[PDB]
From a paper:
Phosphatidylethanolamine (PE), a major component of the cellular membrane across all domains of life, is synthesized exclusively by membrane-anchored phosphatidylserine decarboxylase ([name]) in most bacteria. [name] is translated as an inactive proenzyme and undergoes self-cleavage between a conserved Gly-Ser pair to become an active αβ-heterodimer. This maturation step results in the post-translational modification of the N-terminus serine to pyruvoyl in the α-subunit, which is an indispensable prosthetic group for decarboxylation activity. After the proenzyme undergoes auto-proteolysis, an active complex is formed between the α- and β-chains, which are mainly responsible for catalytic activity and membrane association, respectively.
Using native and selenomethionine-derivatized recombinant PSD1–287, the crystal structures of apo PSD1–287 were determined from two crystal forms at resolutions of 1.90 and 2.63 Å, which are described as Apo-PSD1 and Apo-PSD2, respectively. The asymmetric unit of Apo-PSD1 contains two αβ-heterodimers, whereas that of Apo-PSD2 contains four. No detergent molecules were modeled in Apo-PSD2 structure. The N-terminal pyruvoyl residue (Pvl-254) of the α-subunit was unambiguously identified in both apo structures. Gly-253 of the β subunit, which is no longer connected to Pvl-254 after auto-cleavage, is approximately 12.6 Å apart when the distance between two Cαs is measured, and it forms a salt bridge with the side chain of Arg-221. Consequently, Pvl-254, which is located at the base of the funnel-shaped active site, is open for substrate binding. The biological assembly of PSD1–287 appears to be a dimer of αβ-heterodimers, (αβ)2, which is commonly identified in all four structures presented herein.
Residue numbers in the entry:
A (entry chain A): 8 to 253
B (entry chain C): 14 to 253
C (entry chain B): 254 to 292
D (entry chain D): 254 to 287
Amino acid sequence: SLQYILPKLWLTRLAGWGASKRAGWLTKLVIDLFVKYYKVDMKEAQKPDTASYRTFNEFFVRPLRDEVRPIDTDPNVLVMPADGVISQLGKIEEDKILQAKGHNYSLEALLAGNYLMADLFRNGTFVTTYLSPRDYHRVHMPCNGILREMIYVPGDLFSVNHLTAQNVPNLFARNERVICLFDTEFGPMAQILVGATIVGSIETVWAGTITPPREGIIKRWTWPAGENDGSVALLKGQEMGRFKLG
Amino acid sequence: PKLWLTRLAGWGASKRAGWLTKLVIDLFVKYYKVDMKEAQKPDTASYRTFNEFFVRPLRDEVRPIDTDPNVLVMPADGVISQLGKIEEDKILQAKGHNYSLEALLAGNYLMADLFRNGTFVTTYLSPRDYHRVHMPCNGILREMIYVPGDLFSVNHLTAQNVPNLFARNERVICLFDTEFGPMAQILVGATIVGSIETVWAGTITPPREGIIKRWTWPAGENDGSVALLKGQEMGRFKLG
Amino acid sequence: XTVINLFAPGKVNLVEQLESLSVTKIGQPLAVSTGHHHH
Amino acid sequence: XTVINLFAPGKVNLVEQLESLSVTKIGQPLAVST
């Protein structure tokens, strides 16, 4: 693995520069090569014409047709927040979360040493969903929630995939990420957006782009309980954030 | 490429290379003007590795500890970078660079709130200086936090120009109970001199596992408590 | 990339069919509440 | 490298002589209790 050798931050900035430029034919060419190599179902997209996208990023963050992702309306059901495949899921064994066969990671490591937040989730349940490059790169709410806390965590830009997940220790605990904590009818609920090499930009609908820039410090925002003025509520199935290049 | 250069220097500084070791130590002592008269072993030949020399002990007599129990004493040889009042959350780095108390403590809002409107002292250790760090006063160790970070150079130049330098560089935060309330002593690493130790835990870094780790200890009363005395060695910096 | 969810102890049961490499689509069932809600 | 101390509000006064680039030893006075 050139995972420890490669200058992952400069490659990510290069892709971000690239993916942000409005280059007509070269933009449609890279989008078209991309759609071919990765097998993107453009029939699911709101705009299936690869010509409709001013920049590569506009395409990466492309919206879907509403009807092709029906939201389970049963209020007893929490729904999947992202297109892709499950990496691992199940019980949080005290503090231990499963990364892969014979790689555990700390709940407190994942939450950037936040022992109070970790305490909410000790012996709870986790789900880790992997977004492949072909998949839709916006993230939706699993259920209704009031946003209470958001924490930006500086980190590495390791690649995320079956290979690195199986071989890089503490991958999700050391990669740049945004922790979002909501109050729900199911108690406290964390939804964590973990960046990777190239696809390193994280946004939320309430804050815009969190990263870049990369200022190298932990930043914490809080919001009040649902009752109060200035509270931010989201519904099951509603967009909360996305990943783009840069 | 600051991490690989730091590993290179650590490999270098750890090797027992007789004449090449004494040569680099001798060039070092000359260029930086090291007072070897203050050293326990003034003979540059006495040091098996460069690191043994970097972390060299001083003569017992030469750092007298002020005996007044209402005096807190300096914890490290070097020069004051900045010191004074913590303006709510804001700590002064240099002319037109402030940094957050919460940023420095890796988002630890409870610890930060103990020190809001408190006092800070930032001590710079130049390469010529003794590189062990001593207690400013008696304390019970309650909390230690390792914080992953960059390996920016620390000096007047970078302090004057790199935003949030001490809040983004790899470091070890140590929190004690004292007769003067809570007291934090923070060891911030840099390019080349990037290895941090404490007397109670050994080398914290390297290795660099990329995650925040937190250790706690009980209050002084309870069994398994760790106490240190004013002037006692608590930690050090070496290359690697 | 990746998205990680944390839920509190005894609050939800994950759909039993789901495993490593199971396909995910926005809106599909992920878990059922351990306590009964009604529309 | 660098060493940062934090003390609680109104618990110590720094010796007034100390300023940016002041020389430090290991026993020399840093602050006095209030």
